Design a protein around this ligand. Structure first.
Ligand SMILES: [Zn+2]
Lengths: 213, 116, 272, 147, 297
């Protein structure tokens, strides 16, 4: 409910106050999705002006990952304490979206960490926020993800949703057709076998009858 | 409730306090939330809770071994069993803030009887 | 707070109770019962239920405590690990009569569940609702309110088979494949609706809702389901075990046919 | 000869029969009554079950009374400490020569059985530290237990 | 008019009980109608009983030649299938429960008894036959219900049977269809001796109008449990006992071949049923794999 509270608080604010509200939104805990804030006209109006840095920061927090704050570090404003942790959590979510068994090396590289203890503590505190759910295997150095939240989307990604839902629908339809075909074939086999058995019995009975001569 | 002995009886009281909201403005809510939900209590939170405690509540049977300090360790070890599939001694000790030999001993004690 | 795993036997018990009480009086009445189950930490599982006797004096209804104690003593003999959890009733939204009865129930158990079943509903979903009591201080007195909980239907092969047999009411492979043809037909008719909504939002037919289009993205990302390397060794272990069992079954049937043919042959072509 | 089950059973009877008649043998009888109840690893603490209450504790022999307690608690440290401190007074006796090795081998067995409960792969030098024995002794004890 | 059966008419029941049609014809009762709640409760109790035999009593009435059953309550007794008239061991419970039920609108009288046969089919053994004779002598009308929970799970179909015995000294005429059932070796004798002394009723199930609505609304979250459940891992221990019994049956089959009527065909019939159940357990998993693990990019 936090994001709609901030949006209502930002109905008319613009300029410096809007940038301050953007920073407070990025720092506020529990807000891991910023898509309704981005749809606001005044928020998108920051491109024309000297505040395009905050719009870039919001875009990075909505669709980007932590390594992207490795090449735009100079242009972007300074990042706070909790903001970096939130970006790292969103990077973990982005990694878990693709693969369900994230190796430790990948997390260490993209999250820019040096120790295993620090990485495991970050993953544990990300789990405690209920953005991802999973278990840590240390003998094999894997993070096994059972559930993760859906991050923000652009207008050019919905086509992918349609593409991957069409495959599922077609697979279900093809499974149903195969099931019906198997049922039909089995019924035909049973009927043919009992017709053949009854015909053999009828032939034997006829032979027995004509044998009485 | 937090200082009480382990069991289901204390668990019911923990759930009752958690359902209350007036408890959100208390200084010990940050530890009740982790105690009821089976989370890991770090060192600093326990230090703050002990600092805010009263001297008579800080029982310390036998050689120090403060009872609260042992219960928090046994709760952290139990809570780490849901996040990890298998944990090394050198990093189970660094997670509970104890030497590795102590971590192995506590894990064996809890695994033996019935607690893990 | 807690997680509730309901059982369909409880719902059948409530429905039978209400139908029995209505058929014996010619007018619908409100019924009261009690729920028994198992709780493990923060996971409450309602398993069975029984009836309770209530006396309505003036305008307040009370629950007879001695009758409930008798019923508890009776049922502890049969089910030993099952314990009291809460009560159930029939009606619409929670009412002051319900919140008054909940106090008497709470006098027995610290945290009793409340279940409400609407026998005359108008929506397309199950009318069962679960509540838990939350107390609060306001305006200088303590008021007890109801907080809704989300429940899930529990899993058991015997219970599922019984429920399916009761719901349906009328080759052995053409009768097993139909039980799996009526569950895929329900998943397909939902995935198709979600796809239609996504396409409608794309082309533009309904207001752009971000939450739905994010949950749909997560649902799409959830596939494939557990394609790890260890899975396609247990799956193939099971497949090969069943294949070997089938191989031995065919060998046995062929031996039976062998014996039948040999017996039929050593009658005609016998010269000894 | 060492086989004394016949006297082991008769110890309980002689505790009362010769209590007021076998005065010269009373000093040695009270020490030996503990052994008979001690060999079956059962019988709680014979310190106060029967009519031996007037005797209870004796000032010169106190660790002898706590020997059965240490055996019941299966604490090797108490047993070894009692043996080293009170030597020549608990061990002095003859009949204890034939039974001291039997006694201080059924504590190590229970300690080792409890020790291996949570493990799936254990180190022999690690077992050699809990039990105050060398590696060559713990390996033989493991062989005898496994057999 | 579906709920019309739920109405209890005390006067009509008293008249029917007083008349006693069934004492003139031993083949009177032919139909057995069971409510949905009764069947669910019986299956749940039998499953919760584990591998032991659990027993209980069931309430209802009679209508014409049909035996109507509406509810069942479990009994706190153990050791059935070995003691004759086991229910008497909790006879006081019978008084305590029923007298309670009459206070909450449950007016129907005791009509029958049921027990479970975990993993060895539904029929009546010698002890069960004797108990049914006693019940029919002292508690007429009555009916015996036998349930198989393990086979209900394994075969995917409810395995239930309602039987009534013949009075002592009566000779049953013909009636030898003998629909095949797989009986373990250790209990194959009891089936043979006591096979003509009881006859099975025709079992049908009924549900009220509210039960139908709740059950059609329930099939919106309950379709998940169908294609998210594994049958191979559930009854994995059943098709090892079955294979042991089949291998022991083949011993007698081969011993007869070296020389109790054509045991090879019966052994083949058992092997075919076990293998068919095993293959049914794998077809569902293949379907689940085709639906869920094949939608990658
Ligand atoms: Zn039986």
């Amino acid at each position: 409910n936090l994001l709609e509270q901030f949006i209502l608080l930002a109905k008319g604010t613009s300029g410096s106050a809007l940038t301050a509200l953007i920073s407070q939104v990025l720092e506020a805990p529990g807000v891991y999705v910023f898509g309704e804030l981005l749809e606001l006209a005044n928020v998108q109006e920051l491109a024309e002006g000297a505040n395009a840095a905050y719009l870039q920061l919001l875009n990075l927090f909505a669709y980007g990952t932590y390594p992207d704050y490795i090449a735009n570090k100079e242009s972007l404003p300074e990042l706070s304490t909790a903001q970096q942790n939130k970006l790292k959590h969103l990077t973990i979510v982005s990694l878990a979206s693709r693969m369900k068994c994230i190796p430790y090396s990948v997390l260490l590289k993209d999250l820019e960490m040096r120790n295993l203890r620090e990485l495991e503590d970050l993953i544990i505190e990300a789990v405690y926020t209920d953005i991802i759910q999973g278990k840590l295997d240390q003998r094999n150095q894997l993070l096994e993800v059972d559930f993760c939240i859906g991050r923000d989307i652009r207008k050019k990604d919905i086509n992918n949703i349609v593409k991957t839902l069409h495959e599922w629908c077609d697979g279900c339809e093809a499974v149903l057709l195969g099931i019906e075909q198997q049922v039909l074939r089995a019924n035909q086999y049973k009927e043919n076998h009992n017709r053949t058995q009854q015909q053999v019995e009828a032939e034997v009975t006829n032979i027995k009858k004509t044998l009485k001569a | 409730t937090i200082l009480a002995s382990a069991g289901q009886q204390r668990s019911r009281m923990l759930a009752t306090l958690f359902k209350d909201e007036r408890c959100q403005q208390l200084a010990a809510y940050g530890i009740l939330e982790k105690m009821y939900l089976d989370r890991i209590i770090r060192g600093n939170q326990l230090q703050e809770f002990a600092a805010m405690l009263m001297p008579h509540q800080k029982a310390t049977t036998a050689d120090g071994s403060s009872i609260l300090d042992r219960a928090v360790i046994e709760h952290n070890l139990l809570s780490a069993s849901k996040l990890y599939n298998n944990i090394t001694f050198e990093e189970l000790g660094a997670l509970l803030e104890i030497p590795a030999a102590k971590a192995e001993k506590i894990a064996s004690q809890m695994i033996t009887e019935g607690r893990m | 707070s807690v997680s509730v795993a309901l059982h369909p036997l409880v719902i059948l018990n409530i429905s039978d109770h209400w139908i029995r009480m209505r058929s014996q009086e010619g007018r619908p009445v409100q019924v009261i019962g009690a729920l028994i189950g198992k709780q493990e930490g923060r996971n409450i599982e309602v398993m069975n239920s029984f009836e309770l006797l209530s006396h309505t004096v003036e305008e307040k209804i009370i629950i007879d405590k001695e009758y409930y104690y008798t019923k508890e003593e009776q049922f502890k003999q049969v089910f030993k690990e099952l314990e009291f959890l809460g009560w159930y009733t029939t009606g619409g939204p929670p009412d002051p009569s319900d919140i008054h009865v909940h106090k008497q129930v709470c006098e027995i158990i610290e945290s009793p569940l409340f279940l409400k079943l609407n026998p005359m509903t108008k929506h397309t979903d199950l009318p069962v609702s679960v509540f838990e009591s939350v107390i609060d201080i306001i305006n200088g007195e303590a008021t007890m309110l109801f907080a809704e909980l989300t429940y899930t239907l529990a899993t058991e092969e015997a219970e599922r088979i019984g429920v399916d047999h009761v719901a349906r009411m009328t080759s052995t492979v053409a009768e097993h494949l139909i039980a799996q043809h009526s569950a895929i037909k329900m998943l397909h008719s939902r995935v198709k609706l979600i796809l239609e909504y996504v396409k409608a939002s794309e082309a533009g037919e309904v207001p752009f809702n971000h939450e739905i289009l994010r949950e749909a993205y997560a649902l799409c990302h959830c596939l494939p389901v557990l394609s790890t390397d260890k899975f396609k060794t247990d799956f193939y272990d099971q497949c090969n075990d069943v294949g070997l069992m089938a191989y031995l079954g065919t060998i046995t049937k062929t031996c039976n046919t062998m014996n039948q043919f040999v017996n039929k042959f050593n009658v005609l072509y016998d010269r000894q | 000869e060492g086989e004394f089950e016949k006297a082991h059973t008769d110890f309980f009877e002689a505790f009362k029969n010769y209590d007021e008649s076998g005065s010269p043998r009373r000093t040695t009888c009270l020490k030996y009554l503990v052994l008979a109840n001690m060999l079956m690893k059962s019988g709680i603490n014979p310190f106060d079950s029967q009519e031996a209450k007037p005797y209870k504790n004796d000032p010169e022999i106190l660790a002898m009374t706590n020997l059965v307690s240490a055996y019941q608690n299966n604490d090797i440290t108490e047993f070894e400490k009692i043996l080293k401190t009170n030597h020549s007074n608990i061990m002095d006796d003859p009949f204890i020569r034939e039974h001291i090795e039997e006694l201080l081998r059924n504590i190590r067995t229970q300690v080792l059985i409890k020790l291996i409960k949570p493990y799936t792969r254990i180190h022999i030098p690690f077992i050699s530290k809990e039990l105050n024995i060398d590696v060559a002794d713990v390996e033989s004890l493991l062989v005898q237990c496994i057999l | 008019s579906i709920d019309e059966i739920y109405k209890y008419d005390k006067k009509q029941q008293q008249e029917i009980l007083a008349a006693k049609p069934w004492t003139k014809d031993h083949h009177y009762f032919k139909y057995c109608k069971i409510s949905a709640l009764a069947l669910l409760k019986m299956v749940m109790h039998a499953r919760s009983g584990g591998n032991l035999e659990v027993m209980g009593l069931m309430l209802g009435k009679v209508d014409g030649e049909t035996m109507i059953i509406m509810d069942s309550f479990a009994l706190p007794v153990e050791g059935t299938e070995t003691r004759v008239n086991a229910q008497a061991a909790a006879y006081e419970y019978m008084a305590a429960y029923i007298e309670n039920a009459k206070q909450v609108g449950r007016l129907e009288n005791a009509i029958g008894w049921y027990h479970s046969h975990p993993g060895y089919g539904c029929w009546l053994s010698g002890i069960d036959v004797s108990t049914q004779m006693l019940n029919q002598q002292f508690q007429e009308p009555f009916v015996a219900v036998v349930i198989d929970p393990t086979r209900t799970i394994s075969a995917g179909k409810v395995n239930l049977g309602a039987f009534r015995t013949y009075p002592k000294g009566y000779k049953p005429p013909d009636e030898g269809p003998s629909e095949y059932q797989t009986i373990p070796l250790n209990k194959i004798e009891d089936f043979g001796v006591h096979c003509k002394q009881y006859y099975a009723l025709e079992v049908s199930y009924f549900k009220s109008s509210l039960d139908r609505k709740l059950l059609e609304l329930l099939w919106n979250k309950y379709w998940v449990n169908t294609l998210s459940s594994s049958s191979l891992l559930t009854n994995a221990d059943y098709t090892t006992g079955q294979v042991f019994d089949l291998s022991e049956k083949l011993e007698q089959s081969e011993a007869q071949l070296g020389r109790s009527e054509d045991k090879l065909a019966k052994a083949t019939r058992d092997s075919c049923k076990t293998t068919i159940e095993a293959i049914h357990g794998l077809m569902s998993q293949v379907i689940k794999d085709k639906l869920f693990n094949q939608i990658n990019i």
